Specification:
It is classed as lyase. The structure is a homopentamer. Chain A is mainly alpha-helical. In chain A, about 55% of the residues lie in helices and about 5% in strands.
């Protein structure tokens, strides 16, 4: 029923919404996130990052950690209405910390500018914009509404000005997965305000199927560089898994077309069908190369696509070697196997689908 | 059992509970006062200056220094009641405690976290609640008006913030409300009223009604971890160290409140073990693990057992906490080889001397 | 025939341009250079040097690392038209990083000035000027054309003002290899613009064949110091190998004359003809003394001169002990034997010749 | 000599009669003076390498300089041929004592930017005694204006206070720090024919109330005038230092308490050969607290003329510290306390604080 | 002549270099260490870069001595081999440039003595700088530093004229005979270049240092003099005496010839059946090379200055073999240098032509 190192069944994770209750291990993760003074990640809105120092999070990855926690908390709010207020509180803290210079300051240290939202920098500010929207869908609070409208207009105006569809992270550095976050943030703003910023999405989905995708492999190239026209000629599994998951919330048929191809290209089923692991690129047998996140993002994609078999296989690969334990009702891993480990396992366990988040029942 | 001395214990529970009646501290309490006061530069109460070598040597985290100073101060106030011959020394140490508490090393996390340059103007009640209680206890012990103008100013900030808030009490930064931090601030208003004949303590009844209605699970006798008034969230876990601290301070203001919940608190959290000889405290529900979270459930429950007059539980807890830390006396000064938690020597000192918060509130004026 | 411990045969490297495809290990090197967020050397145009921190590159060597990667990327553009846009993008990043104060700021820290291009400093600004030109040959982009024109004129004007042929790196410190880069940059500017800045080259080639070369040994002296007149009395293999490789792009006959003499002076064939290693100076049997780059620059010169036998012998010496491996389609060395290791083995495996780069067809 | 003793007690006590320091005292002066840059008395500049090498804590440097200075003043009385050297070293001691490395804890702790304006009597009492001893040894008026200014600050602060003496900070009064300040007034009066010392009788009357246990011959650790507190532990090092300096001003005072002090704190052991000093009551442990009870008792035994206890204490202190003489300079491999070489030097030479007050004028 | 165990070349070979007009191969390998490798060789650049000294762990306060002793050796290379004179001049230009950098003189300001290291006092620094200016111009004929040389020579002349004792202090109350020896020799060199008579002050100084500063029977100087107190530190010093007698031999040969045999009896220990020698730093000890640890190395320079081939051989047999020299790629390294300034002082003693020969160097 449960192999060593698994805490709950795949059936149990997929049934949380129908039961209106998170699993006990998800509650223990929420306790890790919230319980201990000063050192839990969601203790305070202040510019303190002790939880991330303790996990040895690299500075450039903090912005991804906060965002992926926020996306998981939005699904907790949909699963269990009794945890919606807590999830809203944690989302307020997530937005507050995301705005701290420890999180965005690499933009200035690299020489690109003193203001991280004014131009470009869509990985940072796409996540921030999606977070502002999810906070307001969950709580009904207008605390960040003026900032949200301002950043949504920046994103709209940059897309409208560019001859390619979307926005760069820096001059000649375009990433499809960073764009996927920014476009989903426009769908959320439209849900809140009755606007049509999402009308830009069709041009983007047409553009990314042109030279940014390998159609036979169902896989995006690593990056695009508009000034040279270059596409870096390696396909990327973690890039593809993230992008197809977010796109499925905006154009389900797009992701349904490429998902089986993606699986054939990258996913290695092993141990008699019990486990799976994901190769990061073509022309290798090695799993989880590059940034080391192909299997963890494919676990999120399997959840988004409703693929219980692949979800179970990947969590059987990822969770047992990391040695979970529950101490004083809080979850810890002795041997996290990647960056963003507890963040991505939490998000995949609770994820209700990006379309379900867009359609979240309005706040009491 | 209260007159037995287990291995790793320095004085009996009977001896600690008899100190006020005998008008003398135990020898190990005196040896703790020697640790606190004796060696130049490195003892914690050597000087009023902004020097923290004693805390560097113990590896105290910056955010915990304010609690270390405050818990030492609360124990020093009880030393003043136990032995009139030590009351002047306790007053001198309280002056140093207040002076160090005002140093930016102690409060400066407020500014580093981005909340402001002034740690008392608004919010921040754990820091400024302890500072306000310290100002009051210093003046009750000494009769000195050295800090009276600052005490009046901070008492009025606290009074005005309570009056302005729609919930009863003050936050620790927007949407972060802690019952234990508020308990300190309310007790500080009782002390100001004792010194000045005022009625700032009239706010207390609305606060006790609010925390009993909304923030306690009355059947378990246990408070929830925290309240977040903007979102309305209550973090849905009960906390033993939060509850032990809050019930101990509340017992000084409304004894009946803490007497109602104390037996239920013990059933919820306290594990008696070793054939009744020892006890250890679980931090939350749904676990068998002792002293999770911040690791202070047993140490705060030792203070609560002293406040409630529960000699049996005090003995059990001290039998769990003290022997593994390996106390000894060297050159008439107390040392521990293996302190078991943050705030270890501070909380064991406080629990060994504690006269009760009601007795501190009523401290008779000093001899001329 | 694949020699032990090698990734590809010498025949395979020399056939890349005819096959219009890089070898799989060259592609794996391009993956190392480009793939991983933040830590790959060609991730961003920003002033971030994590890739160089992870390799323990000394500050003073970063400028050479960037330039030698750039020179290899220009040959990738000629080998495979389908990788020309990638090579162009990487060259844009290389120019951007080369202008960062982390790269040039030793000039100011040493006390020489706040502006690294206005005078002297030809190793830095010679490489930057060659990189501006190669970027524009590969891409057709005029992004850096005004900066290129400005720096080409500074180089022209300094050559015209000096009584010796060329430019110093600081007062009394003249290096033939740094001048070779600067002169090659004038040939590239002339290819792009139809100018005649290269007309200064003949006076320079005449000058360096006086007190700066031992013509019998085919070897340059370490350095010249025009204020004292001093020539440092040691011959240098890495100085000679670099200089003869770049000179072969401007005056092939010069390098054809000295190359066999250079090999007799410095090159030790060993292991029954299978391997070779290069002595850095005369009067020693030790290989790869000094900066430790004689064998690696001789690998580049063997490629420039079309010498497949010596190329094979040197790569059999250099590559196996460094323990290459390919993980997730990206190349790593466990034990690089020198500074600039992956840069110089990359450049020598792809190098099409400096004259072929000069004559690169438009995009 | 028993292992780790360098000279007999008879030899130390006979130095003034022989007009010569012992060879180990000369080897200590060589440690103090010989090696460029790293000897403590090499230069008058604000360099503290000797103290960095001994790991002296910042707050202890002011005591180290002062105790060296007090030993140098006795060297000047022992051997007229070393009086000029002792004066030169005293000039450097005063110069270094004024450096912010030495006094700057006053500002870092938040008490003020001026270390002499008010309070801070441990620092400025030692500085004022040093100014006086420098002028007694040399006849130089180099520091006379500064000496007059600081003497007047001390006189005016004593006159303003309702308790007898001066605090180190508000509510922190130390009898041993006051003993230094009062002795500095006796030295100023010897030099100038003034009567600043008239304050001494009120101070000796005051410290024999709540600050001393007369039956034990022991001072309490500290007094806190704002609260009235006297810390309730007696202190051996505090008592030994205070009785030694007081014996120079009121010999009868120290003679009254010295036998009681010895009964309270001194343990003779090893068949009468050794002695060691407990720091407080209610312990069998020697040298607790700051770890200086035995070393200050060695100074007190010298001041009181107690050759037996001096020998017993030096037999305890010196051998385990493993002295040796290398190139005519004294080193200790295992100093047992802070201020170790300073206090053993001072006790070996000390002529008595009254003898320093009566020092004949220079030749 | 037989090569003693562990030596690179015979004493006969070092003493024959000037007559043969060629340096020995190990001296050439030392010049290669000094000049060959980019960035890390000490004489690579005129810039304020000290990597060579960082690699040897040279203390900051000793850098000024390292540069000066290299410079004095280079001046003798110029006399030994006309073909190396231009190289020696180039290296001397770099030596002067580096000597002027704040890393070299800045202890003067850090210790609190002033912002200008030449205006007054500080004769060890500025005496060496002044001698280096002169030797640079004798070797090259270059007037690059002539204005600075004239300025510093006048400062030294004016300070000697103002003082009631003969010479200049390092700091107030600290007078060192060896530091003064350098400053006086610098006046002889300025006079050789300019036909002036700044050297006229030398006789008063030689008279002065033969009073309380010398033990005439032992042929040994006291460690230091302190004019404000009148103190003379009561220990005689071998390294002080060896350096002073070497430089004085270039100005008053008879002075050093008088005291040299006495100095040897006082301090020099011959051992190993006459094969080796080592030098005691002070009286009243059997220990060799106490204090700063340079008595044997400075006595090797003095043996060379005085033409004493037997003592030179004995001292080099003591100093060089245990330091484990080797030649790698034609460049000299020591595995175990025995003291500060080790490769500098062995280089200088191996080439030294005599301070009188340097003073009278024939033109380029």
């Amino acid at each position: 029923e449960l192999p060593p190192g698994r805490l709950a069944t795949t059936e149990d994770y997929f049934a949380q919404q129908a039961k209106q209750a998170v699993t006990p291990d998800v509650m223990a993760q929420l306790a890790y996130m919230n319980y201990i003074d000063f050192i839990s990640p969601f203790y305070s809105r202040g510019c303190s990052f002790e939880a991330w120092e303790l996990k040895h999070t690299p500075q450039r990855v903090i912005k991804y950690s906060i965002a992926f926690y926020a996306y998981g908390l939005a699904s907790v709010a949909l699963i269990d209405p009794k945890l919606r207020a807590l999830a809203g509180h944690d989302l307020d803290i997530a937005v507050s910390k995301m705005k701290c210079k420890r999180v965005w300051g690499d933009w200035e240290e690299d020489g690109f500018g003193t203001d991280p939202i004014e131009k470009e920098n869509i990985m940072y500010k796409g996540h921030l914009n999606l977070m502002y929207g999810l906070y307001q869908l969950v709580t009904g609070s207008r605390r960040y509404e003026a900032e949200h409208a301002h950043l949504t207009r920046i994103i709209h105006d940059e897309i409208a000005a560019n001859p390619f569809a979307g926005i760069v992270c820096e001059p000649d550095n375009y990433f499809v997965q960073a764009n996927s976050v920014a476009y989903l943030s426009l769908w959320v703003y439209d849900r809140l305000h009755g606007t049509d910023y999402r009308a830009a999405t069709r041009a983007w989905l047409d553009f990314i199927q042109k030279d940014l995708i390998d159609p036979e492999r169902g896989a995006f190239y690593l990056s695009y560089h508009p000034e040279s026209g270059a596409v870096k000629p390696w396909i990327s599994a973690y890039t593809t898994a993230w992008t197809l998951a977010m796109v499925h919330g905006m154009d389900p048929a797009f992701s349904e077309r490429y998902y089986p191809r993606f699986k054939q290209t990258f996913v290695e089923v092993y141990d008699e069908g019990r486990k799976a692991r994901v190769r990061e690129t073509a022309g290798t047998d090695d799993a989880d190369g590059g940034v080391g996140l192909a299997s963890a993002f494919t676990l999120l994609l399997a959840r988004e696509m409703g693929d219980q078999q692949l979800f179970d296989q990947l969590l059987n690969h990822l969770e047992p070697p990391a040695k979970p334990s529950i101490v004083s009702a809080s979850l810890r891993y002795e041997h996290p196997g990647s960056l963003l480990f507890d963040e991505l396992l939490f998000l995949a366990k609770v994820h209700a689908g990006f379309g379900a988040l867009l359609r979240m029942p309005p706040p009491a």
